Assembly symmetry: D2
Homo-oligomer: 331 residues x 4
């Protein structure tokens, strides 16, 4: 076995066709354009590789065996690491001036980054929903045809990471009312602590406190949630949300240490996915002038685990957090 043959470089390193050259006027910087995109696509494939694997672990119920949690967090962190690189990779294309890109931009028409099948498959597999997806020029799948359109559909219809994480989050231990009844203990301890606290600048604080109280108690409005879920402003089942907050509050508890890491990485992937979009935009600006559709992609509308980010709003004094009783200290 030789490197070149192991890596099918006969394919990889014979995939560069400068359209400028194909049309008689070869432009040098076009090479970079091609390579950059090809590298992105390689890495997308790797992310899909990792993601699909993680999805499978959830779907096949392997995640139930908490031995598989190391594997899950490892592969999720790996995604975040690839993404961190893909963000830095824009620095490479920033070496191309707009003036120089202009010299071949025409031979690209009518092509677009939009037509990255993998990027869409990625958005889909994480949990970006078309219902909340910004339409571009009153139009995404329309541009894709064939097996591509077919796969794109499977991607939308098969379980997303969000869905699968939701499922698992719903089964998070300690939610059982017959058990630790976290939610009940929480509502009580908060209401109590609230009242205790509720017993000039005073007025200002009072006003602030009423605002805080509303938010804090908003947590227990199952209906508010269902509504927001419908409007798509939240994404996680109320039960899943409970499991997540369980994990947040009892993270140091051994059974919840890696699960918390997952949540952290899930948020990191959202953060990075959006950083990708941002860097892409800042460039398309520097390259095409005036952008706005893309500036719209950086809107938290594409944050799939936005629920995890927003659990920061509902932070309470440590004192108020239900205690780890002997029984659960065992469990």
């Amino acid at each position: 076995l030789i490197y070149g043959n192991y890596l099918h470089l006969e394919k990889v390193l014979n995939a560069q066709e400068l359209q400028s050259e194909t049309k008689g006027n070869k432009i040098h910087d076009e090479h970079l354009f091609i390579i950059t995109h090809q590298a992105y696509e390689l890495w997308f494939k790797q992310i899909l590789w990792e993601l699909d694997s993680v999805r499978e672990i959830f779907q096949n119920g392997h995640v139930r065996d908490e031995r598989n949690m190391l594997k899950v967090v490892s592969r999720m962190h790996r995604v975040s690491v690839i993404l961190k690189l893909l963000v830095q990779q824009f620095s490479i294309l920033e070496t191309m001036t707009a003036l120089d890109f202009n010299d071949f931009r025409e031979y690209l028409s009518p092509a677009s980054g939009f037509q990255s099948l993998q990027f869409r498959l990625l958005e889909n597999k994480i949990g970006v929903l078309q219902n909340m997806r910004v339409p571009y020029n009153r139009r995404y799948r329309d541009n894709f045809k064939g097996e591509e359109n077919e796969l794109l559909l499977k991607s939308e219809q098969e379980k997303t990471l969000l869905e699968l994480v939701e499922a698992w989050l719903e089964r998070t231990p300690g939610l059982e009312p017959h058990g630790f009844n976290f939610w009940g203990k929480l509502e009580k301890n908060i209401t109590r602590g609230l009242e205790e606290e509720f017993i000039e600048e005073k007025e200002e604080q009072v006003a602030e406190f009423q605002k805080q109280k509303e938010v804090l108690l908003s947590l227990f409005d199952e209906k508010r949630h269902e509504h927001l879920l419908s409007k798509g402003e939240r994404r996680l089942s109320y039960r899943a949300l409970q499991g997540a907050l369980m994990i947040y509050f009892y993270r140091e508890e051994p059974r919840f240490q890696v699960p918390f890491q997952l949540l952290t990485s899930l948020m990191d992937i959202d953060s990075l996915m959006t950083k990708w979009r941002y860097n892409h935009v800042c460039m398309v600006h520097r390259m095409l002038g005036s952008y706005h559709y893309l500036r719209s992609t950086v809107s938290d509308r594409y944050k799939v685990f936005v629920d995890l980010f927003n659990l920061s709003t509902y932070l309470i004094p440590r004192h108020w957090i239900p205690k780890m009783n002997p029984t659960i200290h065992k469990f």
Copy 2:
């Protein structure tokens, strides 16, 4: 034209074949290994693209037209930027544990990164010389390569390297002409003078430990500084391969260093800086590679590799070492108005 078809993704995204899977026992992390290498190879191709272009500009004498200097420095900086990324790219493969790599390392033998044609072409096109190449397994590197590959690899060694081409251009650097600004002459004189002047300074110091310190500092500096004009020392070191640039080229480089602010020398200096950046980064690549192979294979290619992280692989080491011959600014020959115009 569709993106997928423009980018020949039919090829790119149909090039991943897990040998573990080909042999029945698919290992997940093997995918990463493949992709990582494929990305490296893509980027190598791009670097070769840039480098070959720069070489051509030098060889076809376009570099004489100083309008092409922007293009040259841009493309050279771009190389350094790709390399910066290729160094960071190791962070990705560091996500793979040794334990997990072990689960497929077998299905790789007898393949190695050594068989990267592009990496070799790259080493060669910059200016790595086979004479000063550390032997692998008591043998040459091209021994591992056969066919058109071996053929190309030779062309790469024999065709003009960036070093050679930069040397040529450095030799033509204005200001060296003795009939002109006579930089080298003025320099030798101004250094001789400065040294003497400083000696008197130290002589003035009543004998003390302080004076002693200065004395030692002085003598070492003097030796080094005058070493610069020992054209024979140079020729010797050139032979031993410890330097690489013609003495004339070395003069042009120091010209550029000292008169960098001069408009004609501003971008030329940037080039020199980038040339050094490429060496620095190429070495950082090697270092990160080694640091990983250690984490992955334990402890020995490791030792062979630890050997490749040396000035033997640094092509523009001469540019780095011009830092040793740094002098007080007031010693630097003053740009004569006439030649001040020439620059």
Copy 3:
């Protein structure tokens, strides 16, 4: 002389006071919070150092001596490099969980990064204009600052900004002189001509939707391209604050863009590129800051900040927008050998 004494580490490394600890309940992650900010502030000081130096080079007219161009681009690139780092530095504070920050956030009230004198000095010295600055809680920013601080902050606003100084220099860009190369005239002509020539091409074409599409494209392009020569449109946009550069400065910048390979314009172009890099990175800083305040406080300042990530805080947005007015290379006015002389140093 000792390292520690050279670097006044007696000060630097005795400047960490955890308020949590000062109040009896020391929280560990507070140390990180302090250090991170202190490092940012060190780097801000360095950027101000570089910026002020470059401003002075422009103000004192040293920039006229094109020897100083290397120094200028070097120091400007250095800023962009510091900024690149400052953006990555958020990764450090991302190690702090919101849960853990919550354990000391209280001992901070009412303090805020908003009270970063240096950040404001920086925004100001580059060219952020108060009129373009989104007010927070219906209030100005300097209103939070008092004393010599307010005095400095004012000097920053009143002294020449980099924008102003670059504008001045851009206006003196060679090639614009009508008596000389008359770039703008030649350009208007060459563009008007080219457009006509292209219109004919399209009109020659065999009736199709593709033709219609090209027709549409053509009108759009034509409008934009000719918009360039509407000095009144410019003055209007300047008023609306969509542009920031004088029309003449804009001419000089496009001169440099189009004739960058010309020796005299090689480093000047690099400067333009760096100026844009600084804006890009400054905005990336703001973005990462926001993305974190979200991760930390949830969803409001957050929205104020989300507002700061706009081209309204981009000082050299005009340089970014010169990409809109890109023309076929063959349309660019030709450099006379004789003319190449004023661009050959």
Copy 4:
């Protein structure tokens, strides 16, 4: 409470004294030099903050409560993140040319980065051993430091290092107990067996160059694999300082490596990974430092430093070298339900 006052910026931003300026000939790039170092020092303080905290968790036996494992790995990862940045931070100082540094290097003598108390404290607290410290021009390291400096430096040397503390904890790693899972025994057996089994396979083959190659490989592997059970070889190497961990600690580490997916070993493995990352990064720091001092001073400290980039400075080299003793997975002693149940929480 004001930002500036919280952060004692009266100190931090009044700690820049350009010696060039103090001596009449201010050099611009000296500012950068100062700031860069000051930032490094801030971050070192933070690393020491994190490290000391982790050391205390180990020393005070809090690590026994496996709730505190999350905290430990988090803080150790944070160190690695700071270090990643400190490595990138050299990019900033690379903006300074040697030519320009030369213009002030004189006013620095006789100061040096060597005199970073914090860096030494850091090296010491991790586990760099004074024995294996390469002498600089036949000089010690501590010799340069006097007073409280020397005092603290010693405490750092004498107090428990991270290595020592990790060793302690590694020795208490569950599964090693002979009356329990007897990992070591089961391992030796399973390895001896596997090797024999493989030898037979090769013996069954027909004499050939391939066979010889395999045979040679097999003997090499066998030696290494069985070397693992030579407690005395270890003790010797420990003496020569080629290894650092007790043989029992080494057993615990390999336990963790092999049974990492086991819940009780998942975070512990992460720690090991981060410990190795800290070595890797600490050494990357040294490398980048050297690469620069060369670019700045030419080629000597350079060579002394090139010496610091060795496994002689790698504290957790034992963790790196556990990669040598990797065996087929099927050879690894199996976690029987009963004992698996012991390793859960």
